[PDB]
């Protein structure tokens, strides 16, 4: 079945300590979170760089990990239920606080939890370049030659077009509508991964480290090793959902000249570009594409996901 | 049918005249070993590093290649019989003797060789990836797309996860019921090329050049030409098995980060966790992880492990 | 009396930090260790290097210090009874958990803490040597003059050669009547400070972070403040008692020649080169000889043991 | 059908001016080669190195192209007859003798060209990695999976063993069974690419530029524009054949380690091990065993050889 997402963000510097932490408590948290049984697996992303559409953001590059001197991360846990994110939270507080809060000294913004529904899902399980023999095997066994995914390998060897839209008020079906048709069009494109479209719920402030006055004194003053009260978030999560209603639409790749011209097929095949135009009628914001590496993952939720 | 297996260990100088001493002592003791006929093949891997399990060792890394200043060797052979292997050892004691002590001048500690039964191995056999096309024409040509394997590259291109356990006394059944459904479930995970069981059965005496007095003395003022007494072993292979019970979960992986997180679904992954968990309930040591490179083998073992 | 010898072991990356650590961390422990009323003392190693045994181990010698990558330590903790060290672990839990844990960034292997009887023991008190004018008068002046020892200096101003050994099942008795005959006659050897047997009693869980899945679990995600559940240790002492019969042989020398040489007369003087072939007789593994250096100590473990 | 082959071999100075020869003038040789009818295509070797055997060649290596002062060419051309061959030399002579002899600056040894049968051979078509999904596509189309090929990469992309040998009178029976059983089993070894085995008929005097007198001297003062006479060649070519018969065994890798272990396996697999043994019996000379390029080739005699 589909799953929740909750995508974690953060800026951080973009230095060798950075990285360190990332390979020593990331795994941490990780360990954490799967205490929940409602916890079907993650998918953490870095952003490389930006979609600079020729030179509307003349200044970006997809890949500008060079010379950049901070390091976005967009870390993807998902759930069957999103209660199961904010039960998961305060039931293992203690842990995860202080784990989280050893990211801080290397933070520049975050953290910021939104919450997601997938309302489209075209996402097929990750494989090695040594698998497909055998998943080949497989799928002819059980007659179900068009079950055979593409081969889209796990731990950094694929990437991922990040597209934030907000949408006008009273324009969310047409904008479903026009993106699902998009996507199922745009899945011709080579090197086209899978996509799926998010649409926020709300906000997880135990996950945004958002509380009221007494846990916000207590994350301040915080030596590391006391938790905030987690009954000190003054908000549920649907409280936080915001109008104009905001999507991502997720879509993977299998280079970064795949993601430029498979993402360019909406703006250069005509066919396409007259169905996507029904989706650009509706923004109030975007599209603005990050380009993300998903490095650290769970691949079974797309286990989960496909059954 | 299943090979028995002895693993000689040894630890050397990382240091260019080791490796060379790999390259032209290896083969030749290799080929010595070939003269048996319960001979059924070989794997030797050097350590590449070790699973740090996010900051649990936190001095190590799974490439610690660059810094380390010695080597470890966990040579595999196996062996229809594994009285084969002693018998092959005396049958050509002169050479056997000669050429491993040649190594003497870079060792830093071993030879060890403990002697294993395998209870549980899901092993393909190798292919490069030239072979690949032949190996699905035959399969389908047998109706037998089932047997498809992945694609395991030999010689280097592969990493291997080399588990150390041992158990309670009285948990050896728990263990290895647990440690079969947790290798079941383990083998969805992208990458995954394959896993066996190996359980001590005892040790080899004359693999480990541990002698009685007399073949001590022969072996410590040995000019490199003259053998101990291989009469002089004072005990069995079985008469050395240990007790807690030792265990190697032998674990191959398309690279570090399938194995990383490969092996992270049995803490990922709420359903394997808790099967492996009732593996972590009998150990007195381990899981202790090492990363290991098999360079050199003799893949025909795998065709006779799988008939 | 002869106390219950607890040896924690580990290995740790070679550089300044680690050392740091050790000095910083390690009298902290110790502060703590000593709450215990059955705590009698203390002696911490660290390895320089491996006795080659002529060129057996011809990669190695007896100070590798400036070489290697790794530092291996050995802690040894005196008790009058071996229930005393689990009490003291566990009643001091969240003291030592966290000390020691804040170990682990520099960790490679460990820690491994088995426990051991001492079976022999001919071991001084220590002296500086401002001290022996005063321990000479003392003894004349009791009208013992036999009573007064060699000068065995403390604190890194002598060297421990840490011979390893297991014995075949069934050769207990030999090996044990052999090295107590050796160490007798081994005496007469110029630099000689003392020896003990040590014969293992069995491992400490607790010590060893040898815990079940949920203890595990509570190691491998903590933040550093969170102590695993002490009581989830699965295995008493004695029920990881290894069987071969694993010993330390445990000789103490003015300095490394002395040791070298020392040492070699159980393989240069014929007389007792007959009797410690009894010893080599019985073994399974060994002996296998590191080399130490006994840094950090509380020497009135040697009270204790002499009354 | 099988084709004869005329192999040129040649030995010049390892320096750019030489490989800028080879890639200007050699496919000038190739295309007059063409003008032949009979002409199938062709398979052009550099040398790279020996294999060592352990350490039997010890100052040899697989890959000997940074050291080593000369390059050794085999040139393998395939004609329908191997009079189709002499006949084409005759029919270009000014052609090609001009060609071949402006390389004579770089020259150091050769040129010698040998004439072969192919008494057994195991050889697929080349394919690039971008054909094998047509191909596979075809023989499903065609009913035919089994003879979907392994992926034999043309143009460098692969590794040939070149083994020498030369047999006792007599034993040329026991020879060519031996060693096609030997084949015919080292078809599992992974990598294993395709066999032939090359039995020498005789030795080409024109394309050996061997004249009698006359024809040497006008080698010797050739200007590089004047063409010896033709009809001075004072042998057939089945006059110079040799005996002790001559044969190469021509096995083909994906990769250099996969020749290494893949070509062991006569020495490794003890069932194969007997098997080869039978060839050995019958040897004045070899195995001795180049390691060749094929870089330039023409690569439909494959075709012509399969049909
Ligand atoms: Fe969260
Ligand atoms: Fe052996
Ligand atoms: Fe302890
Ligand atoms: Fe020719």
Redo the contacts between chains.
């Keep these: 079945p589909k799953p929740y997402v909750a995508i974690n963000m953060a800026e951080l510097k973009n230095e060798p300590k950075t990285f360190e932490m990332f390979a ?2 990331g ?2 948290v ?3 979170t ?4 409602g ?1 079907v ?2 998918q953490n992303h870095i952003q490389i760089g930006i979609l600079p559409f020729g030179n509307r953001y003349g200044g970006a590059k997809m890949d500008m990990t060079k010379e950049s001197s901070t390091v976005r991360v967009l870390q993807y846990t998902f759930w069957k239920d999103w209660k199961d994110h904010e039960e998961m939270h305060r039931q293992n507080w ?2 995860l606080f ?2 989280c809060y ?1 990211c801080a000294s290397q933070m520049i913004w975050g953290p910021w939890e939104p919450i997601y529904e997938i309302i489209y899902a075209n996402m097929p399980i ?6 497909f ?2 998943v ?3 799928k ?2 059980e007659g179900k030659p068009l079950d055979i995914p593409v081969i889209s ?4 060897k694929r990437v991922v077009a990040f597209a934030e839209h907000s949408v006008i008020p009273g324009k969310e079906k047409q904008f479903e509508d026009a993106i699902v048709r998009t996507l199922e069009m745009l899945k011709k494109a080579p090197g086209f991964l899978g996509a799926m479209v998010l649409k926020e719920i709300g906000v997880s402030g135990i996950g945004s480290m958002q509380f009221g006055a007494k846990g916000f004194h207590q994350v301040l003053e915080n030596p ?2 006391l938790e905030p009260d987690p009954n000190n978030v003054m908000y549920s999560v649907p409280e936080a959902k915001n109008t104009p209603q905001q999507y991502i639409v997720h879509v993977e790749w299998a280079n970064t000249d795949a993601l430029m011209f498979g993402m360019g097929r909406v703006l250069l095949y005509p066919e396409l570009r007259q169905v996507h135009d029904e989706v650009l009628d509706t923004l109030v914001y975007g599209p603005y594409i990050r380009i993300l590496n998903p490095m ?5 939720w797309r ?1 989960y996901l496909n059954e």
Tied chains: 1, 2, 3, 4.
């Excluded at 990750?126 to 698998?131: F, Y």
């Design positions: 020593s408590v795994p941490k990780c360990m954490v799967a205490r929940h049984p916890f697996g993650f203690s842990y202080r784990l050893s990750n494989t090695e370049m040594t698998d023999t055998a080949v095997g497989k002819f066994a390998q796990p731990y950094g590391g090793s650290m993952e769970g691949t079974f286990e």
